[PDB]
Amino acid sequence: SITENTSWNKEFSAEAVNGVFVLCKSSSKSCATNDLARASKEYLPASTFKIPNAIIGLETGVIKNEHQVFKWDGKPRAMKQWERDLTLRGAIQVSAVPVFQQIAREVGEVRMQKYLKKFSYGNQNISGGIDKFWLEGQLRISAVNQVEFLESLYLNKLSASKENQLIVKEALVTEAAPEYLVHSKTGFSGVGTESNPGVAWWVGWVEKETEVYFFAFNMDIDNESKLPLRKSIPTKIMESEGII
Amino acid sequence: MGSITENTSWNKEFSAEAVNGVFVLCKSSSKSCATNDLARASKEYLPASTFKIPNAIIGLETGVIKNEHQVFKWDGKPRAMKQWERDLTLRGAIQVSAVPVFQQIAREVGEVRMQKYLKKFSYGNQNISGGIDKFWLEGQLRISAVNQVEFLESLYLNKLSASKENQLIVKEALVTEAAPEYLVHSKTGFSGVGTESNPGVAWWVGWVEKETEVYFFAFNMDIDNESKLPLRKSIPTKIMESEGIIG
């Protein structure tokens, strides 16, 4: 069950942003959102796909273990922050696309398809090129599906060893406080094209006291300068809810 | 570790705050350590709440603690600290150093198993006599800063005699600072203000993962007044910032 919560609309209007926020307390059985329709609309996952990709990489052995170092071969990479040796967390934190493209290539189309089916990951469409389906392909997943997926990870219920799920969870920690812990991942498909803006994401969960909150946010975006809103809008909503 | 060297210049942060203590910092790749005082780096002190690290691992390995989702319910009885009067998860109990939660764990573990694990972990002088629920608080258990970093490195590498799954659970619970370029896992400790001419001890131990490098650290200082407690984190932090590790 997904229920509408009109009290968050202001946060979107203030910035003239078209997007959705999904927040579920304790579990995904009851989630709140500002837009029922957009909550379940499937969008390209962009870099949020690094979460399932990391899990699959570990499960298949492509990623040897948590201490694996992904060496930079010295060839030019889109961003300078990617031009260096990276650990799994390092690669996830700076969203080093090339590291995960190679992981995807080694996983292969057959295994990738099998795991997304096991994970009930969006439309599970990986066609068009094994190293770019989550960047410009036909893969689509909704905010609600993201929360369901993240909840399974939190509970160690995905079809992978608990060990591997724990490894990925540690790589996803983005904020640590004595009060709460935040695990999250950003995504940005690009500025989109004429009349078809791209999508920006921020998904994760907050562990506070004995309670847990799963969240997923996405928005239309046609200018990179608006990118910070993918974190500020959800953060303001969660702060006003007294979560972080 | 492979080597250790003395760097007396780190006494700067100690002298400035009129503090007697030690800091040990080891780089994983080179397997080399540095400290402001070799003698104190090897001196053994009560672990205080830093013992919650091995205690948590042992509780999990023995099955006393089910997993990271187990909730330690508060029975409503008054506790030494107001922050402990609430239900807590494993991480919650570790973060606020809820002593009563771990004393119960220790009692369920029992002396025989506790002794077995500390031997496997090569944890300090491995003397747990004087009460199964307080040997690390006011008993005869002692461990040095060098031993702390050795122990923490083993945990980091999942090389302790425990399931990798349980070591991962504890490691997750120890995260105290997260940034894009570095992650900090740590645990504080404080035995008390001690007696006259015999001050208590305050600790801050953990490790920092920055880039592909890993730094293990252990800090302790003499303390006879709680107002000096924040120094257990500020001194080590300043030293690591000067080293360009955190911040």
Side-chain angles (χ1 to χ4, degrees):
Chain A
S1 179
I2 307 164
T3 66
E4 185 183 63
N5 183 321
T6 59
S7 75
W8 305 333
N9 299 304
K10 173 55 59 60
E11 298 293 1
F12 289 94
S13 298
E15 309 299 317
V17 170
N18 286 312
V20 65
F21 183 57
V22 178
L23 181 64
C24 330
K25 179 171 185 295
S26 304
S27 72
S28 67
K29 70 173 295 298
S30 58
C31 297
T33 184
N34 60 302
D35 192 315
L36 295 190
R38 188 165 177 134
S40 297
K41 181 174 177 180
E42 308 188 308
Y43 293 93
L44 187 77
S47 291
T48 61
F49 189 69
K50 288 187 173 56
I51 301 181
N53 205 5
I55 297 171
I56 297 168
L58 285 160
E59 278 300 297
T60 62
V62 172
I63 298 181
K64 177 190 176 186
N65 57 57
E66 89 198 70
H67 299 124
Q68 159 107 46
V69 170
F70 299 95
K71 301 280 180 60
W72 175 50
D73 60 8
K75 305 291 218 309
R77 286 182 166 178
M79 304 194 79
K80 279 191 183 303
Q81 52 174 36
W82 300 345
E83 302 187 315
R84 53 169 163 165
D85 292 350
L86 291 165
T87 59
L88 179 59
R89 178 186 169 73
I92 291 172
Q93 295 294 305
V94 297
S95 204
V97 175
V99 171
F100 281 85
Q101 287 180 296
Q102 185 57 33
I103 288 169
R105 297 186 192 105
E106 288 177 38
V107 166
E109 64 190 353
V110 175
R111 289 191 296 192
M112 190 68 80
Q113 183 70 81
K114 177 175 63 183
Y115 279 97
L116 294 197
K117 185 182 305 294
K118 286 180 167 178
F119 298 168
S120 291
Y121 199 87
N123 67 2
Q124 302 165 33
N125 188 159
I126 69 168
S127 69
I130 195 60
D131 65 4
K132 68 186 180 179
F133 60 87
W134 68 93
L135 302 170
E136 61 169 280
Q138 303 188 322
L139 182 54
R140 303 281 185 280
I141 185 171
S142 72
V144 171
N145 199 164
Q146 289 263 27
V147 163
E148 288 176 346
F149 176 72
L150 294 172
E151 167 183 49
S152 291
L153 176 60
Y154 167 72
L155 300 172
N156 301 306
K157 292 178 182 299
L158 290 178
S159 304
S161 69
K162 173 169 180 169
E163 179 180 309
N164 288 332
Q165 295 179 73
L166 285 169
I167 288 171
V168 175
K169 282 187 276 183
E170 175 141 285
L172 289 173
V173 179
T174 54
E175 201 192 332
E179 319 72 65
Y180 63 80
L181 203 62
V182 177
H183 292 71
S184 71
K185 184 67 190 77
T186 49
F188 175 41
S189 71
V191 297
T193 52
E194 175 69 13
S195 301
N196 294 48
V199 61
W201 294 88
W202 192 43
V203 307
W205 72 93
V206 186
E207 295 167 2
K208 183 186 175 195
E209 300 300 88
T210 50
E211 189 59 77
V212 63
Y213 297 88
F214 302 99
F215 68 88
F217 172 99
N218 67 56
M219 62 182 263
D220 285 347
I221 182 166
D222 66 33
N223 196 300
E224 213 169 18
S225 64
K226 293 299 185 69
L227 202 53
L229 300 173
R230 70 183 171 176
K231 273 191 182 176
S232 62
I233 294 181
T235 293
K236 282 179 174 57
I237 293 177
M238 288 191 277
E239 293 183 313
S240 77
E241 295 286 320
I243 301 177
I244 58 182
Chain B
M1 297 304 297
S3 73
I4 190 164
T5 183
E6 198 173 66
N7 180 175
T8 56
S9 71
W10 284 357
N11 287 311
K12 173 183 180 295
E13 308 297 354
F14 286 94
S15 292
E17 304 283 357
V19 168
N20 279 155
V22 67
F23 186 55
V24 179
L25 179 65
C26 309
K27 186 184 299 181
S28 184
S29 69
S30 58
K31 212 81 174 192
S32 62
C33 308
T35 181
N36 62 301
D37 192 283
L38 288 167
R40 191 176 170 121
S42 294
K43 193 172 174 65
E44 311 182 306
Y45 298 94
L46 275 166
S49 294
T50 65
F51 188 69
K52 283 186 179 59
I53 298 179
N55 206 183
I57 298 175
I58 298 171
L60 284 164
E61 202 55 31
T62 61
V64 167
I65 303 178
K66 183 172 174 49
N67 52 52
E68 73 274 30
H69 292 141
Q70 183 183 323
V71 179
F72 299 98
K73 295 283 297 184
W74 176 47
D75 53 28
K77 280 72 172 299
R79 283 177 169 178
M81 290 187 91
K82 167 191 53 55
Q83 281 186 170
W84 304 337
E85 311 186 315
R86 65 180 62 186
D87 294 340
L88 296 159
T89 56
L90 176 55
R91 153 170 262 273
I94 292 174
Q95 294 297 299
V96 299
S97 285
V99 180
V101 170
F102 280 80
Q103 289 181 302
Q104 180 49 47
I105 288 165
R107 289 192 291 267
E108 294 187 44
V109 169
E111 184 152 356
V112 175
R113 290 189 292 188
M114 188 66 81
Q115 190 76 68
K116 177 183 59 182
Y117 283 103
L118 297 193
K119 179 168 182 299
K120 287 173 179 299
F121 297 174
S122 291
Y123 199 89
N125 69 354
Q126 315 178 198
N127 186 161
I128 63 176
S129 62
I132 192 59
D133 51 27
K134 49 194 53 182
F135 61 81
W136 69 90
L137 301 165
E138 67 194 26
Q140 301 304 302
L141 183 58
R142 305 280 186 278
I143 186 173
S144 69
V146 174
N147 195 167
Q148 289 267 29
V149 297
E150 280 168 354
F151 172 74
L152 297 177
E153 171 178 49
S154 291
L155 175 56
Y156 167 73
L157 300 172
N158 303 306
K159 291 177 64 179
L160 290 176
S161 195
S163 70
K164 171 166 173 159
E165 175 172 316
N166 288 329
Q167 296 179 74
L168 283 170
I169 287 177
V170 175
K171 292 161 64 179
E172 181 177 19
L174 289 165
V175 175
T176 54
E177 195 189 336
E181 287 305 302
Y182 69 81
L183 192 60
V184 177
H185 289 77
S186 69
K187 184 72 196 75
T188 51
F190 176 46
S191 69
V193 292
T195 56
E196 181 167 61
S197 298
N198 297 69
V201 64
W203 293 92
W204 196 42
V205 309
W207 68 93
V208 179
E209 296 157 356
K210 185 182 183 179
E211 176 206 285
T212 64
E213 191 53 277
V214 183
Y215 300 92
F216 300 100
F217 69 87
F219 168 99
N220 68 54
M221 63 181 274
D222 288 337
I223 182 168
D224 56 40
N225 170 41
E226 303 203 14
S227 78
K228 307 298 182 180
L229 203 57
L231 296 179
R232 71 183 166 182
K233 297 172 78 167
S234 61
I235 296 184
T237 296
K238 288 177 172 61
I239 293 178
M240 286 187 282
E241 294 185 320
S242 72
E243 294 293 307
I245 304 304
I246 55 183

